[model samples]
Target: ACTKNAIAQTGFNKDKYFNGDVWYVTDYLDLEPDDVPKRYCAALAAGTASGKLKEALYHYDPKTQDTFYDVSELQVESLGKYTANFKKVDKNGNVKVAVTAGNYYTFTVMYADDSSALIHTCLHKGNKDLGDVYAVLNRNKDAAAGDKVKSAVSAATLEFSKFISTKENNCAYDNDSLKSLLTK
Candidate 1:
């Protein structure tokens, strides 16, 4: 059945393989608190080297259609990782993992600047499915842009800024930001 195929496609344990340290560069468009269309280009790093998970976020804003300007550190979180399914590809381009969690499924894709490796995650239950895409980069290298991938990488530093924010261990960035804005 179609459901069975979906499950078999994203079935790896992401929490176990997506371990140690990882750097991410995300290019996503979402509505701001005032419902304005905003484009976000961020460079982030998450690792388990400091006993607890630490993250640093840097954001850039556009100036005009041709030229752009303005940059800032959005927030930070000393959190931990969560559990999720991993989607893997075999040597013959066959899907090796599948989601068996629930009737609904979640999918996340990360596209990196450097030639590191591709990572995928998904979950399923009931009749619902969720997915996310991430563009990742190497820690020791600077973020780059290309036609193969859309959007440029923000600043290439993991240095924590004055905007040291906090969040629960296993929470999404946008969800946390929404919660902060609503409380304020």
Candidate 2:
């Protein structure tokens, strides 16, 4: 079960968010801990490429050295809400796995400012059971969640204290790879 009608930002700006730049996932809250690693680092680049909306994702585990990359094409469901289909890709955008049925997620921007944002996602992958995942994103990987974004978390009826900070992992991202993967 998921919140299909989960609220979106009252007023969201797509241009600034998907402005060909990277947004680091500085903190995250996974309602279903079994679905993903308890401690992880992730980031994404949202922008338009080849006249299509695309998002490039990078996930890393500092302890295990597990890393993954994905490229997703987004379809607008409404303002600040989208359905995105993803395919695993290499750092250089070579497809590791093609997009398959149910390899997708529903994304909603709960709140967004120029510097930081709070977003929610419910993923559907290969019929596995999953739950809502909320993330705090910032333009700078080291940036902390500000008052606005923190307040947004509370607005969503969630406790900010429950989120796990990714900064403690000594995580490093390949900026060039994430940027270039947008088109692939």
Candidate 3:
């Protein structure tokens, strides 16, 4: 049911976005109610290791104390669009579940800058397919989405007011693990 063929960033710089730095989710909009939590915090690291595109993800639920990590290998569909294979992993980079044939996600960079970005994703796992999930990212965990990213949201035909902010979640991350996970 994920139907958004999201537009790519006007001129996304792949090298700059996948620069081995971590990006924190500042706000999010999940189009599917049953497929998403009421409140959560997520972050990701996109970078290349040994000439291969890789991404490490971290999701945390402040209220429920639920957390998980994923490591993905990406194949480009276009300049700013990708199909990725993800494997659930531990904080220390140990695989908890192996990557399966039909388990994957499509990622699109709708907007990106040195310090902020807007992305859209549709995840498919097992027999379930999720709806469009959009996340606004920032280099700083506590930073607010500025006009730049907000403009990108509205440009995508989404309401900025509907997005939920993660700043008030009392969230914390293990920077070391999220960074080191890239190579694993």
Candidate 4:
């Protein structure tokens, strides 16, 4: 038995959707004076326990009425080490090619609801810290198209990121404050 749901009631899956994890930017206090994280949100889709995979980054701009911005597609591979290759789409037509290489230090499912789940990742070896990501898996809810919602989500993500990086040692995800976000 795989012991995993394909399409969870939440319409998300740990194996094949953003439902597995929704990565966010750490909190402001948790950030260094010059540390500006690129990604506000990310998700993983592992087709199988051991097989090809996909990942994505979701961008949003509350400033404009169009809350959605762009979704970056990444090709994931793991022969000996984990690597993701993708093109980062920005405002300009120029797309930047980027790669994320890292090893999984920890991957865990913390909470699950009919429409959501919570997952955490810790990268130990790579150009980026995989473990730095703490995802709150849930239904694909889009923040309201307004500066308020956008600013709130952005701030929360940054705060969460900071909390994870500093207090959680950039690995642990079982924190009360972090978990509280799931309810809201």
Residue 98 alpha-carbon offset, candidate 2, angstroms: 0.3
Candidate 2 residue runs with Cα over 4 Å from true position = 1-4
Model 4, span 26-64: residue lDDT tens: 221212322324323332233222243434333332233
Give candidate 3 misplaced runs (Cα > 4 Å): none
Tens-place lDDT per residue, model 3, 1-184, is 7888988897899999998999999999889856887788899999999999999999999988889999999999999999999999999889999999899999999999999999999999977888899999999999988999999999999999999888888889888888888998
What's the distance in Å from true for residue 111, model 4?
Answer: 4.4
Q: TM-score for all predictions?
A: 0.27, 0.96, 0.97, 0.34
lDDT per residue as tens, model 2, 107-126 = 89899989999999998887
**Model 1 Cα lDDT, one tens digit per residue, 1-184:** 1221111113434333224343433323211212222333333333333344223222333322221111111121111122333223222223344434443222233233233322222323346333332233433333343333332212221112211121211212232331222111
Which candidate wins on lDDT? 3
Backbone clashes per model, in order? 26, 0, 0, 13
Candidate 4: residue 50 lDDT (0-100): 28
**35 Cα displacement, candidate 1 (Å):** 4.2
For candidate 1, what is the total of clashing residue pairs?
A: 26
Best by TM-score: 3
Question: Candidate 4 has what TM-score?
Answer: 0.34
The whole-model lDDT of each prediction reads 0.28, 0.90, 0.92, 0.32
lDDT preference between candidates 2 and 4, better one? 2
